[PDB]
Design a protein around this ligand. Structure first.
Ligand SMILES: Nc1ncnc2c1ncn2[C@@H]1O[C@H](COP(=O)(O)OP(=O)(O)OP(=O)(O)O)[C@@H](O)[C@H]1O
Ligand SMILES: [Ca+2]
Ligand SMILES: [Ca+2]
Length: 364
């Protein structure tokens, strides 16, 4: 093979996923955190490990880069520590959030070519990559991560900006809500250390009820839904209706004091903002992606809720790939490996010729 390996980097609000194009899974996954004393800068797992003596910064907020100096440190960490490669020796495919500001796209481009000297690079919308990973070029993606959720209508490979909706309700909000209701139960989960424990409980024992009220009634009249969780010190606690009450906030944000529509309504509203001619394709291809869509039972619940909102004659189909926690990254691996995509990379030559703004023409 004459070609060097291409890198695929998916930066998220809570976790970054990095690897090599062609692989079926990322080689490294670490927290999107940079810390400095309360080496001078700590990044990823080590930063989390030593958070006690550091002041942490989160470069990506709600999917958007807001601290470029620390974002640069996360990328440096990715190349040299996690993947152990030299960026000037490999093309790099980066991911971005839906509706990412123009100026941000140009900044990412300039940094890759001028700071890391990448031989080539490209930036793709996260939701679009997840759609590709499911074998589709048309459909609507509900991407819910740790800091933000988006409903992104995509037609023939192109996202529709006017119909994209953003919901600032995701994994982090759900973790804190579980800490709250478990505390109301009689336990006490309030510290940063305890937040990590509860995040684990959430990922291991939570689920989406098909019928909220019936589930609440079953939990109130029996112990059939209770599950046990063992703490490090050995204490075993019980989780009951909290198991499904936590993710229920996705469908009813008022539980969190938010007036926003739930994920089902948001999905429906995005579809209605699209041209009537493509709505049926979207209803028949609603794909879930992101860690927060991993809850058991979420696909069937979405099927039920959307069916209730859409015309009775509409064919509804919810797709929930088993590997959807990393579908964004996998889609990127697939894209960067495609024969027809090789001509799409922005080369150092092209960057030198057109500058940062070339990203708007090359990465549409
Ligand atoms: N099995 C699971 N069940 C529920 N939540 C889960 C599960 N696995 C992971 N999560 C949650 O998914 C979130 C992280 O997912 P993801 O990596 O998609 O987000 P991100 O890309 O870091 O952030 P964002 O996309 O908001 O910018 C965390 O809140 C985590 O607790
Ligand atoms: Ca993400
Ligand atoms: Ca409400």
């Amino acid at each position: 093979d004459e070609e060097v390996a291409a890198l695929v980097v998916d930066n998220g609000s809570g976790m970054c996923k990095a690897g090599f194009a062609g692989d079926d899974a990322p080689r490294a996954v670490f927290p999107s955190i940079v810390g400095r004393p309360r080496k001078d800068s700590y990044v990823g797992d080590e930063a989390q490990s030593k958070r006690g003596i550091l002041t942490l910064k989160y470069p990506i907020e709600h999917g958007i880069v807001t601290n470029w100096d620390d974002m640069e440190k996360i990328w440096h960490h990715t190349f040299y520590n996690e993947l152990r490669v030299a960026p000037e020796e490999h093309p790099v495919l980066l991911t971005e959030a839906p509706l990412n500001p123009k100026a941000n796209r140009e900044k990412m481009t300039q940094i890759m070519f001028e700071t890391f000297n990448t031989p080539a690079m490209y930036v793709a919308i996260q939701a679009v990559l997840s759609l590709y990973a499911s074998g589709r070029t048309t459909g609507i993606v509900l991407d819910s991560g740790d800091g933000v959720s988006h409903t992104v209508p995509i037609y023939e490979g192109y996202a529709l900006p006017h119909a994209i909706l953003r919901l600032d309700l995701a994994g982090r909000d759900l973790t804190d809500y579980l800490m709250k209701i478990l505390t109301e139960r009689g336990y006490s989960f309030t510290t940063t250390e305890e937040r990590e424990i509860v995040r684990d409980i959430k990922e291991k024992l939570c689920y989406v009820a098909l019928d909220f009220e019936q589930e609440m009634a079953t939990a109130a009249s029996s112990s059939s839904l209770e599950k046990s969780y063992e703490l490090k010190d050995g204490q075993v606690i019980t989780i009951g209706n909290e198991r499904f009450r936590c993710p229920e906030a996705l469908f009813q944000p008022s539980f969190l004091g938010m007036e926003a529509c739930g994920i089902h309504e948001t999905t429906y509203n995005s579809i209605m903002k699209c041209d009537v001619d493509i709505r049926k394709d979207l209803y028949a291809n609603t794909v879930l992606s992101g860690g927060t869509t991993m809850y058991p039972g979420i696909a069937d619940r979405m099927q039920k809720e959307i069916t209730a909102l859409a015309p009775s004659t509409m064919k509804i189909k919810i797709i929930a790939p088993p590997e959807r926690k990393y579908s964004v990254w996998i889609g990127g691996s697939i894209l960067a490996s495609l024969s027809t995509f090789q001509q799409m990379w922005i080369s150092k030559q092209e960057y030198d010729e057109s500058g940062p703004s070339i990203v708007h023409r090359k990465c549409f």
